[PDB]
């Protein structure tokens, strides 16, 4: 359940999420597009879902991809800001979950974002410990799909 | 064009937007729900558009309305953070515009949000000058509808 998944965000996990977000959240445009391009590059089978964005290989030059990417980073900002209150975290998670359920995105496919997050964190010198923390947060969204 | 509208936002207008957002954006859950409930109170004809959120008169207790309201405040956060780069502002504005075009929300209907914004600003003592600044930002989105 979403609530049990949310319960897994312990004190250390929340700390690791905040500390790493201070760095990756400071460049939403750059890191957001990096996240998306890495997803498309490593999981080419997911590109079909993003038909509305056009030629996603254009990266930063594609305005639709840039707009989508920046907005996605604000969803993460949203999650981080709700870590203090699990009932609020759950209602925003469920809101975004619906955006993906309507696009027929399963829990398994949503989980494909973990690879890209691990790589982006790694490029900023944040290792496995941080990648695992982020996987826990992603797991909360997965529980709602 | 949307770019024209964005490019018309001046230094004094941006200053007023940021100064007022420092306050209204500090309690996203509270002011977000206040915005939505005020819209429903003053413009009852819009309630039907939000059927997905369920019984909106439940206010804060309605988890779906709460999730929506908090997320709406991050859309405004997004706009405020992109004020100095018109190209970035335009791409996020067009992204959110699509969310409304798909729901058949016209430019005139979107402008109905100005009343609620004016009232919420007034609750924190931000007057007409600030309401006009916000109407200019809303007009940027209207240029995309
Ligand atoms: C960190 C994880 C992710 C977050 C926070 C996230 C967030 C978002 C947000 C905020 C939107 C815009 C919602 C809307 O306006 O309708 C979106 C759209 C979308 N997401 Fe995700 N997403 C994530 C991962 C994924 C993954 C892994 C997939 C695919 C396997 C996916 C597929 C989609 C699709 C298809 C859209 C619609 C794009 C469009 O046509 O505009 N998302 N996502
Ligand atoms: C300050 C202005 C506004 C902003 C920034 C804004 C932002 C948003 C956002 C971020 C969403 C979620 C998009 C999605 O996930 O699909 C949304 C949904 C929606 N908005 Fe707005 N909106 C604004 C004003 C309005 C107004 C005045 C109306 C028209 C009465 C409107 C009607 C809708 C509807 C019908 C939905 C879909 C709700 C649902 O079923 O989830 N919006 N808006």
Swiss-Prot record, chains A, B:
It is found in: Cytoplasm. The keyword Mitochondrion does not apply. GO terms for cellular component: cytoplasm. GO terms for molecular function: heme binding; identical protein binding; metal ion binding; oxygen binding; oxygen carrier activity. Its main location: cytoplasm. Keywords: Cytoplasm, Heme, Iron, Metal-binding, Oxygen transport, Transport. InterPro entries: Globin (IPR000971), Globin-like_OT (IPR050532), Globin-like_sf (IPR009050), Globin/Proto (IPR012292), Mb-like_M (IPR044399). Pfam families: Globin (PF00042). Heme b binds at residue 100. The keyword GTP-binding does not apply. SUPFAM superfamilies: Globin-like. Belongs to the globin family. Homodimer. This is Globin-1.
